[PDB]
PDB file of C-alpha atoms in Angstrom:
ATOM      1  CA  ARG I   1     102.168  91.179  91.417  1.00  0.00           C
ATOM      2  CA  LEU I   2     100.511  94.344  90.122  1.00  0.00           C
ATOM      3  CA  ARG I   3      97.325  95.594  91.767  1.00  0.00           C
ATOM      4  CA  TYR I   4      94.714  98.115  90.694  1.00  0.00           C
ATOM      5  CA  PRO I   5      94.135 100.620  92.202  1.00  0.00           C
ATOM      6  CA  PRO I   6      97.907 101.030  92.634  1.00  0.00           C
ATOM      7  CA  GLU I   7      99.909 102.090  95.658  1.00  0.00           C
ATOM      8  CA  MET I   8     102.466 104.807  94.814  1.00  0.00           C
ATOM      9  CA  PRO I   9     104.151 105.768  98.104  1.00  0.00           C
ATOM     10  CA  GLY I  10     105.891 109.130  98.043  1.00  0.00           C
ATOM     11  CA  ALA I  11     104.285 110.180  94.757  1.00  0.00           C
ATOM     12  CA  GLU I  12     102.385 113.438  94.421  1.00  0.00           C
ATOM     13  CA  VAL I  13      98.928 112.753  92.992  1.00  0.00           C
ATOM     14  CA  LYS I  14      97.416 115.141  90.446  1.00  0.00           C
ATOM     15  CA  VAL I  15      94.209 114.770  88.449  1.00  0.00           C
ATOM     16  CA  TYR I  16      95.115 115.416  84.818  1.00  0.00           C
ATOM     17  CA  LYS I  17      91.728 114.682  83.226  1.00  0.00           C
ATOM     18  CA  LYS I  18      88.057 114.529  84.259  1.00  0.00           C
ATOM     19  CA  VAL I  19      85.986 112.413  81.861  1.00  0.00           C
ATOM     20  CA  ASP I  20      82.785 110.430  82.530  1.00  0.00           C
ATOM     21  CA  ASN I  21      83.021 111.255  86.254  1.00  0.00           C
ATOM     22  CA  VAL I  22      86.399 109.456  86.321  1.00  0.00           C
ATOM     23  CA  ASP I  23      89.359 111.294  87.892  1.00  0.00           C
ATOM     24  CA  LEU I  24      92.424 110.144  85.957  1.00  0.00           C
ATOM     25  CA  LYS I  25      95.571 110.609  88.021  1.00  0.00           C
ATOM     26  CA  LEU I  26      99.241 111.229  87.404  1.00  0.00           C
ATOM     27  CA  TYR I  27     101.637 109.907  90.042  1.00  0.00           C
ATOM     28  CA  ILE I  28     104.546 112.344  90.101  1.00  0.00           C
ATOM     29  CA  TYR I  29     108.021 111.553  91.443  1.00  0.00           C
ATOM     30  CA  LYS I  30     110.101 114.682  91.782  1.00  0.00           C
ATOM     31  CA  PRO I  31     113.907 114.695  92.049  1.00  0.00           C
ATOM     32  CA  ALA I  32     115.999 115.880  94.955  1.00  0.00           C
ATOM     33  CA  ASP I  33     116.510 119.659  95.141  1.00  0.00           C
ATOM     34  CA  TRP I  34     113.468 120.203  92.904  1.00  0.00           C
ATOM     35  CA  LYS I  35     112.073 123.722  92.540  1.00  0.00           C
ATOM     36  CA  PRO I  36     109.188 125.038  90.406  1.00  0.00           C
ATOM     37  CA  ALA I  37     111.562 127.355  88.522  1.00  0.00           C
ATOM     38  CA  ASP I  38     113.495 124.316  87.245  1.00  0.00           C
ATOM     39  CA  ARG I  39     113.363 123.361  83.562  1.00  0.00           C
ATOM     40  CA  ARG I  40     113.915 119.624  83.926  1.00  0.00           C
ATOM     41  CA  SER I  41     113.114 116.900  81.455  1.00  0.00           C
ATOM     42  CA  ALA I  42     110.008 114.845  82.173  1.00  0.00           C
ATOM     43  CA  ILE I  43     108.978 111.269  81.419  1.00  0.00           C
ATOM     44  CA  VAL I  44     105.387 109.977  81.425  1.00  0.00           C
ATOM     45  CA  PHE I  45     104.899 106.199  81.645  1.00  0.00           C
ATOM     46  CA  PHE I  46     101.805 104.408  80.302  1.00  0.00           C
ATOM     47  CA  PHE I  47     101.234 100.918  81.667  1.00  0.00           C
ATOM     48  CA  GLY I  48     100.500  97.908  79.491  1.00  0.00           C
ATOM     49  CA  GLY I  49      97.548  95.563  79.580  1.00  0.00           C
ATOM     50  CA  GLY I  50      96.060  95.322  76.101  1.00  0.00           C
ATOM     51  CA  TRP I  51      94.008  98.522  76.528  1.00  0.00           C
ATOM     52  CA  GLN I  52      91.921  96.377  78.923  1.00  0.00           C
ATOM     53  CA  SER I  53      93.776  96.128  82.253  1.00  0.00           C
ATOM     54  CA  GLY I  54      97.108  97.032  83.849  1.00  0.00           C
ATOM     55  CA  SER I  55      98.325  99.332  86.589  1.00  0.00           C
ATOM     56  CA  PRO I  56     100.364 102.548  86.970  1.00  0.00           C
ATOM     57  CA  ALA I  57     102.396 100.573  89.518  1.00  0.00           C
ATOM     58  CA  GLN I  58     104.018  98.765  86.572  1.00  0.00           C
ATOM     59  CA  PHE I  59     106.497 101.586  85.915  1.00  0.00           C
ATOM     60  CA  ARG I  60     106.870 102.710  89.529  1.00  0.00           C
ATOM     61  CA  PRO I  61     110.471 101.349  89.682  1.00  0.00           C
ATOM     62  CA  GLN I  62     111.427 103.192  86.488  1.00  0.00           C
ATOM     63  CA  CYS I  63     109.860 106.395  87.846  1.00  0.00           C
ATOM     64  CA  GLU I  64     112.014 106.237  90.964  1.00  0.00           C
ATOM     65  CA  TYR I  65     115.136 105.625  88.873  1.00  0.00           C
ATOM     66  CA  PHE I  66     114.599 108.577  86.544  1.00  0.00           C
ATOM     67  CA  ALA I  67     113.532 110.850  89.399  1.00  0.00           C
ATOM     68  CA  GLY I  68     116.828 109.887  91.020  1.00  0.00           C
ATOM     69  CA  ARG I  69     118.580 111.031  87.830  1.00  0.00           C
ATOM     70  CA  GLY I  70     117.005 114.507  87.905  1.00  0.00           C
ATOM     71  CA  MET I  71     113.819 114.093  85.854  1.00  0.00           C
ATOM     72  CA  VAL I  72     110.248 114.703  86.909  1.00  0.00           C
ATOM     73  CA  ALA I  73     108.982 111.149  86.381  1.00  0.00           C
ATOM     74  CA  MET I  74     105.323 110.167  86.413  1.00  0.00           C
ATOM     75  CA  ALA I  75     103.025 107.197  85.859  1.00  0.00           C
ATOM     76  CA  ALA I  76      99.696 107.988  84.203  1.00  0.00           C
ATOM     77  CA  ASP I  77      96.426 106.241  84.794  1.00  0.00           C
ATOM     78  CA  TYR I  78      94.177 106.010  81.745  1.00  0.00           C
ATOM     79  CA  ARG I  79      90.849 104.386  80.959  1.00  0.00           C
ATOM     80  CA  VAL I  80      90.811 100.703  79.998  1.00  0.00           C
ATOM     81  CA  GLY I  81      88.161  98.348  78.710  1.00  0.00           C
ATOM     82  CA  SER I  82      87.702  96.098  81.742  1.00  0.00           C
ATOM     83  CA  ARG I  83      86.935  99.116  83.956  1.00  0.00           C
ATOM     84  CA  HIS I  84      85.465 101.739  81.602  1.00  0.00           C
ATOM     85  CA  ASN I  85      83.372 101.646  78.424  1.00  0.00           C
ATOM     86  CA  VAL I  86      86.286 102.726  76.237  1.00  0.00           C
ATOM     87  CA  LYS I  87      87.991 101.671  73.019  1.00  0.00           C
ATOM     88  CA  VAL I  88      91.611 102.052  71.923  1.00  0.00           C
ATOM     89  CA  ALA I  89      90.929 105.540  70.535  1.00  0.00           C
ATOM     90  CA  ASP I  90      89.769 106.675  73.985  1.00  0.00           C
ATOM     91  CA  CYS I  91      93.009 105.434  75.552  1.00  0.00           C
ATOM     92  CA  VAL I  92      94.914 107.482  72.951  1.00  0.00           C
ATOM     93  CA  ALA I  93      92.924 110.579  73.929  1.00  0.00           C
ATOM     94  CA  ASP I  94      93.834 110.019  77.593  1.00  0.00           C
ATOM     95  CA  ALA I  95      97.535 109.584  76.765  1.00  0.00           C
ATOM     96  CA  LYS I  96      97.527 112.806  74.753  1.00  0.00           C
ATOM     97  CA  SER I  97      95.657 114.571  77.568  1.00  0.00           C
ATOM     98  CA  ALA I  98      98.451 113.532  79.940  1.00  0.00           C
ATOM     99  CA  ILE I  99     101.181 114.936  77.697  1.00  0.00           C
ATOM    100  CA  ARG I 100      99.202 118.132  77.137  1.00  0.00           C
ATOM    101  CA  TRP I 101      98.570 118.480  80.885  1.00  0.00           C
ATOM    102  CA  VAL I 102     102.286 118.143  81.697  1.00  0.00           C
ATOM    103  CA  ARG I 103     103.192 120.745  79.068  1.00  0.00           C
ATOM    104  CA  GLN I 104     100.374 123.042  80.188  1.00  0.00           C
ATOM    105  CA  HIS I 105     101.558 122.816  83.808  1.00  0.00           C
ATOM    106  CA  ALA I 106     105.277 122.777  82.987  1.00  0.00           C
ATOM    107  CA  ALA I 107     105.965 125.940  84.998  1.00  0.00           C
ATOM    108  CA  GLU I 108     104.505 124.539  88.224  1.00  0.00           C
ATOM    109  CA  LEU I 109     106.164 121.154  87.548  1.00  0.00           C
ATOM    110  CA  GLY I 110     109.682 122.537  87.068  1.00  0.00           C
ATOM    111  CA  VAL I 111     109.676 121.038  83.572  1.00  0.00           C
ATOM    112  CA  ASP I 112     111.007 122.164  80.184  1.00  0.00           C
ATOM    113  CA  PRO I 113     107.904 121.913  77.928  1.00  0.00           C
ATOM    114  CA  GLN I 114     110.249 120.795  75.107  1.00  0.00           C
ATOM    115  CA  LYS I 115     111.814 117.915  77.081  1.00  0.00           C
ATOM    116  CA  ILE I 116     108.758 115.733  77.745  1.00  0.00           C
ATOM    117  CA  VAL I 117     109.319 112.013  77.115  1.00  0.00           C
ATOM    118  CA  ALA I 118     106.491 109.540  76.535  1.00  0.00           C
ATOM    119  CA  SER I 119     107.163 105.948  77.521  1.00  0.00           C
ATOM    120  CA  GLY I 120     105.254 102.723  78.007  1.00  0.00           C
ATOM    121  CA  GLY I 121     105.026  98.975  77.653  1.00  0.00           C
ATOM    122  CA  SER I 122     102.996  96.977  75.110  1.00  0.00           C
ATOM    123  CA  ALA I 123      99.580  98.817  74.838  1.00  0.00           C
ATOM    124  CA  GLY I 124     101.171 101.614  76.848  1.00  0.00           C
ATOM    125  CA  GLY I 125     104.069 101.665  74.411  1.00  0.00           C
ATOM    126  CA  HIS I 126     101.494 102.022  71.644  1.00  0.00           C
ATOM    127  CA  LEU I 127      99.973 104.989  73.483  1.00  0.00           C
ATOM    128  CA  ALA I 128     103.393 106.598  73.922  1.00  0.00           C
ATOM    129  CA  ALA I 129     104.043 106.187  70.187  1.00  0.00           C
ATOM    130  CA  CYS I 130     100.631 107.706  69.461  1.00  0.00           C
ATOM    131  CA  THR I 131     101.571 110.820  71.426  1.00  0.00           C
ATOM    132  CA  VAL I 132     104.626 111.339  69.204  1.00  0.00           C
ATOM    133  CA  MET I 133     103.270 110.508  65.759  1.00  0.00           C
ATOM    134  CA  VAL I 134      99.533 109.630  65.494  1.00  0.00           C
ATOM    135  CA  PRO I 135      97.447 112.711  64.576  1.00  0.00           C
ATOM    136  CA  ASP I 136      94.149 113.836  66.117  1.00  0.00           C
ATOM    137  CA  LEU I 137      92.290 111.642  68.639  1.00  0.00           C
ATOM    138  CA  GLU I 138      92.451 114.559  71.091  1.00  0.00           C
ATOM    139  CA  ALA I 139      89.955 115.209  73.857  1.00  0.00           C
ATOM    140  CA  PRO I 140      87.466 117.540  72.124  1.00  0.00           C
ATOM    141  CA  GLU I 141      87.228 120.105  74.943  1.00  0.00           C
ATOM    142  CA  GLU I 142      90.963 120.572  75.572  1.00  0.00           C
ATOM    143  CA  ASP I 143      93.106 123.475  74.312  1.00  0.00           C
ATOM    144  CA  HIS I 144      94.550 122.142  71.064  1.00  0.00           C
ATOM    145  CA  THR I 145      96.921 125.115  70.761  1.00  0.00           C
ATOM    146  CA  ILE I 146      98.844 123.390  73.552  1.00  0.00           C
ATOM    147  CA  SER I 147     100.626 120.517  71.825  1.00  0.00           C
ATOM    148  CA  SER I 148     100.059 116.981  73.111  1.00  0.00           C
ATOM    149  CA  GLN I 149     103.067 115.678  71.152  1.00  0.00           C
ATOM    150  CA  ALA I 150     105.920 114.368  73.275  1.00  0.00           C
ATOM    151  CA  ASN I 151     109.484 115.386  72.444  1.00  0.00           C
ATOM    152  CA  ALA I 152     110.937 111.853  72.609  1.00  0.00           C
ATOM    153  CA  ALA I 153     109.772 108.304  73.238  1.00  0.00           C
ATOM    154  CA  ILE I 154     111.102 105.239  75.065  1.00  0.00           C
ATOM    155  CA  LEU I 155     109.129 102.137  74.099  1.00  0.00           C
ATOM    156  CA  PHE I 156     109.083  98.735  75.832  1.00  0.00           C
ATOM    157  CA  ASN I 157     107.905  96.029  73.365  1.00  0.00           C
ATOM    158  CA  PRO I 158     105.161  98.292  71.970  1.00  0.00           C
ATOM    159  CA  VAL I 159     102.365  97.520  69.561  1.00  0.00           C
ATOM    160  CA  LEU I 160     103.033  99.681  66.508  1.00  0.00           C
ATOM    161  CA  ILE I 161     100.968  98.089  63.701  1.00  0.00           C
ATOM    162  CA  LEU I 162      97.194  97.897  64.163  1.00  0.00           C
ATOM    163  CA  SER I 163      96.093  97.619  60.511  1.00  0.00           C
ATOM    164  CA  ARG I 164      97.070  95.271  57.686  1.00  0.00           C
ATOM    165  CA  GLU I 165      96.486  97.736  54.829  1.00  0.00           C
ATOM    166  CA  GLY I 166      99.455  98.264  52.519  1.00  0.00           C
ATOM    167  CA  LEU I 167     101.479  95.516  54.216  1.00  0.00           C
ATOM    168  CA  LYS I 168     103.208  93.098  51.835  1.00  0.00           C
ATOM    169  CA  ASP I 169     103.662  90.360  54.473  1.00  0.00           C
ATOM    170  CA  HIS I 170     101.552  88.006  56.562  1.00  0.00           C
ATOM    171  CA  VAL I 171     101.129  88.915  60.239  1.00  0.00           C
ATOM    172  CA  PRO I 172     100.090  86.003  62.490  1.00  0.00           C
ATOM    173  CA  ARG I 173      96.742  86.057  64.243  1.00  0.00           C
ATOM    174  CA  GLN I 174      97.056  86.868  67.942  1.00  0.00           C
ATOM    175  CA  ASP I 175      94.874  86.198  70.973  1.00  0.00           C
ATOM    176  CA  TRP I 176      94.651  89.905  71.829  1.00  0.00           C
ATOM    177  CA  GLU I 177      93.656  90.592  68.196  1.00  0.00           C
ATOM    178  CA  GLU I 178      90.285  89.012  69.188  1.00  0.00           C
ATOM    179  CA  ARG I 179      88.573  91.230  66.600  1.00  0.00           C
ATOM    180  CA  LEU I 180      89.806  94.207  68.594  1.00  0.00           C
ATOM    181  CA  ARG I 181      88.595  96.152  65.540  1.00  0.00           C
ATOM    182  CA  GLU I 182      85.251  96.241  67.364  1.00  0.00           C
ATOM    183  CA  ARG I 183      87.117  97.814  70.309  1.00  0.00           C
ATOM    184  CA  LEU I 184      89.392 100.183  68.353  1.00  0.00           C
ATOM    185  CA  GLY I 185      86.888 103.036  68.130  1.00  0.00           C
ATOM    186  CA  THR I 186      88.295 104.169  64.752  1.00  0.00           C
ATOM    187  CA  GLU I 187      89.242 102.796  61.383  1.00  0.00           C
ATOM    188  CA  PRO I 188      92.383 100.780  62.259  1.00  0.00           C
ATOM    189  CA  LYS I 189      94.912 102.985  60.424  1.00  0.00           C
ATOM    190  CA  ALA I 190      93.904 105.966  62.580  1.00  0.00           C
ATOM    191  CA  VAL I 191      95.362 104.250  65.678  1.00  0.00           C
ATOM    192  CA  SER I 192      98.301 102.553  63.927  1.00  0.00           C
ATOM    193  CA  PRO I 193     101.667 104.324  64.499  1.00  0.00           C
ATOM    194  CA  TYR I 194     103.253 102.450  61.574  1.00  0.00           C
ATOM    195  CA  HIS I 195     100.764 104.080  59.193  1.00  0.00           C
ATOM    196  CA  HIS I 196     101.860 107.592  60.239  1.00  0.00           C
ATOM    197  CA  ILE I 197     105.626 107.319  59.743  1.00  0.00           C
ATOM    198  CA  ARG I 198     106.885 110.591  58.259  1.00  0.00           C
ATOM    199  CA  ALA I 199     109.900 112.874  58.370  1.00  0.00           C
ATOM    200  CA  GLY I 200     110.528 115.250  61.258  1.00  0.00           C
ATOM    201  CA  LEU I 201     109.427 113.012  64.129  1.00  0.00           C
ATOM    202  CA  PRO I 202     110.824 113.104  67.699  1.00  0.00           C
ATOM    203  CA  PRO I 203     113.632 110.654  68.513  1.00  0.00           C
ATOM    204  CA  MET I 204     112.895 107.328  70.156  1.00  0.00           C
ATOM    205  CA  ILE I 205     114.474 104.119  71.397  1.00  0.00           C
ATOM    206  CA  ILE I 206     112.654 100.767  71.417  1.00  0.00           C
ATOM    207  CA  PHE I 207     113.393  97.606  73.411  1.00  0.00           C
ATOM    208  CA  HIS I 208     111.895  94.392  72.055  1.00  0.00           C
ATOM    209  CA  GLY I 209     112.452  90.669  72.528  1.00  0.00           C
ATOM    210  CA  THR I 210     113.180  88.621  69.422  1.00  0.00           C
ATOM    211  CA  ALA I 211     111.050  85.755  70.800  1.00  0.00           C
ATOM    212  CA  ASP I 212     108.019  87.942  71.563  1.00  0.00           C
ATOM    213  CA  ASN I 213     104.966  85.792  70.811  1.00  0.00           C
ATOM    214  CA  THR I 214     102.459  88.572  71.578  1.00  0.00           C
ATOM    215  CA  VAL I 215     103.950  91.332  69.404  1.00  0.00           C
ATOM    216  CA  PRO I 216     106.144  89.874  66.630  1.00  0.00           C
ATOM    217  CA  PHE I 217     109.600  91.456  66.558  1.00  0.00           C
ATOM    218  CA  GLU I 218     109.407  91.790  62.759  1.00  0.00           C
ATOM    219  CA  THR I 219     106.613  94.373  62.993  1.00  0.00           C
ATOM    220  CA  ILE I 220     108.921  96.511  65.149  1.00  0.00           C
ATOM    221  CA  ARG I 221     111.902  95.891  62.857  1.00  0.00           C
ATOM    222  CA  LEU I 222     109.836  96.989  59.845  1.00  0.00           C
ATOM    223  CA  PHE I 223     108.697 100.079  61.767  1.00  0.00           C
ATOM    224  CA  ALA I 224     112.243 101.090  62.715  1.00  0.00           C
ATOM    225  CA  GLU I 225     113.588 100.601  59.182  1.00  0.00           C
ATOM    226  CA  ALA I 226     110.847 102.779  57.685  1.00  0.00           C
ATOM    227  CA  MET I 227     111.438 105.438  60.330  1.00  0.00           C
ATOM    228  CA  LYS I 228     115.180 105.506  59.622  1.00  0.00           C
ATOM    229  CA  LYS I 229     114.418 105.885  55.908  1.00  0.00           C
ATOM    230  CA  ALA I 230     112.385 108.996  56.793  1.00  0.00           C
ATOM    231  CA  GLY I 231     115.400 110.463  58.621  1.00  0.00           C
ATOM    232  CA  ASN I 232     114.148 109.821  62.149  1.00  0.00           C
ATOM    233  CA  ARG I 233     116.288 108.684  65.071  1.00  0.00           C
ATOM    234  CA  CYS I 234     114.593 105.353  65.856  1.00  0.00           C
ATOM    235  CA  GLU I 235     116.932 102.941  67.640  1.00  0.00           C
ATOM    236  CA  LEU I 236     115.624  99.375  67.947  1.00  0.00           C
ATOM    237  CA  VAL I 237     117.469  97.298  70.554  1.00  0.00           C
ATOM    238  CA  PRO I 238     116.711  93.575  70.173  1.00  0.00           C
ATOM    239  CA  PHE I 239     116.859  91.418  73.288  1.00  0.00           C
ATOM    240  CA  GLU I 240     117.874  88.036  71.898  1.00  0.00           C
ATOM    241  CA  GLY I 241     115.605  85.189  72.959  1.00  0.00           C
ATOM    242  CA  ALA I 242     113.549  87.460  75.215  1.00  0.00           C
ATOM    243  CA  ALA I 243     109.793  87.036  75.533  1.00  0.00           C
ATOM    244  CA  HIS I 244     107.005  89.581  75.863  1.00  0.00           C
ATOM    245  CA  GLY I 245     107.403  91.586  79.066  1.00  0.00           C
ATOM    246  CA  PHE I 246     111.113  90.752  79.503  1.00  0.00           C
ATOM    247  CA  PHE I 247     111.917  94.305  80.665  1.00  0.00           C
ATOM    248  CA  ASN I 248     109.682  94.410  83.735  1.00  0.00           C
ATOM    249  CA  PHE I 249     111.019  94.753  87.255  1.00  0.00           C
ATOM    250  CA  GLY I 250     111.157  91.281  88.775  1.00  0.00           C
ATOM    251  CA  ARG I 251     111.354  89.282  85.530  1.00  0.00           C
ATOM    252  CA  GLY I 252     114.413  87.105  85.033  1.00  0.00           C
ATOM    253  CA  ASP I 253     116.962  88.440  87.517  1.00  0.00           C
ATOM    254  CA  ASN I 254     116.290  92.123  86.751  1.00  0.00           C
ATOM    255  CA  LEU I 255     119.100  91.909  84.187  1.00  0.00           C
ATOM    256  CA  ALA I 256     116.938  93.125  81.300  1.00  0.00           C
ATOM    257  CA  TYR I 257     115.299  95.602  83.685  1.00  0.00           C
ATOM    258  CA  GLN I 258     118.664  97.159  84.555  1.00  0.00           C
ATOM    259  CA  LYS I 259     119.831  96.899  80.942  1.00  0.00           C
ATOM    260  CA  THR I 260     116.876  98.817  79.482  1.00  0.00           C
ATOM    261  CA  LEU I 261     117.313 101.523  82.123  1.00  0.00           C
ATOM    262  CA  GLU I 262     120.987 102.045  81.314  1.00  0.00           C
ATOM    263  CA  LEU I 263     120.221 102.099  77.578  1.00  0.00           C
ATOM    264  CA  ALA I 264     117.290 104.469  78.112  1.00  0.00           C
ATOM    265  CA  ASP I 265     119.512 106.632  80.324  1.00  0.00           C
ATOM    266  CA  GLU I 266     122.206 106.759  77.635  1.00  0.00           C
ATOM    267  CA  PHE I 267     119.561 107.635  75.034  1.00  0.00           C
ATOM    268  CA  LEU I 268     118.313 110.538  77.161  1.00  0.00           C
ATOM    269  CA  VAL I 269     121.861 111.810  77.686  1.00  0.00           C
ATOM    270  CA  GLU I 270     122.510 111.504  73.941  1.00  0.00           C
ATOM    271  CA  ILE I 271     119.548 113.717  73.001  1.00  0.00           C
ATOM    272  CA  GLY I 272     120.447 116.246  75.687  1.00  0.00           C
ATOM    273  CA  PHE I 273     117.526 115.605  78.056  1.00  0.00           C
ATOM    274  CA  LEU I 274     119.724 114.303  80.883  1.00  0.00           C
ATOM    275  CA  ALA I 275     123.155 115.133  82.265  1.00  0.00           C
ATOM    276  CA  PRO I 276     125.767 112.345  82.374  1.00  0.00           C
ATOM    277  CA  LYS I 277     126.253 110.384  85.579  1.00  0.00           C
TER     278      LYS I 277
END
């Protein structure tokens, strides 16, 4: 199972953020025949764990796959509640710092600063969505003239609704909702991707199980329908009968794992970030 600190063999380690004497690392998997002058697409994975735990090792298999396909793939560490005195808003700031750091260092990374993909699972899928559509929550001392907004997103059963304001439906109480409002660090709408749907957003694809008992599928369905209405490319792929975490390497018989990769691959080829196989 996953361990923290993680082991990322063959990954180049770079500190992307220094905050509260914590060195937050990116674990970078470069493709074959990589050179700094390249202008490759990049993907940054944010692990899940309810903004409380988790490990960058979670998306290590996906990093190796997309590095094999020609991307600069990386897994970001970020601060979480069980290890650091942080709230959800602090995690968002770390995720944005990671995107900004990749863009800022795009020339030394061999990366096209306009082809940076944010990706993640559950809380990490929420963070990835925040880097494409949730305003502000930036580290105060960073260069805000360097955008922290990713150019696409690939979300694995993310959390996308963190407030109940304006919603015309009932959303069931969840264990992880354990008055997380005390650990949000902002008014809930300010960390709720659903509440910042608007035209002109980067394209994304979302994988979600219809039997997810942690994040109800309907919240993601409602999100995708509202994003389509605003003109955005937001493809929701239901996994029928799948539970929370279905996509992970090792779950089931890696069928959903392989399936999400081939769908994510096709999505990246569609939007011109990846060459066909």
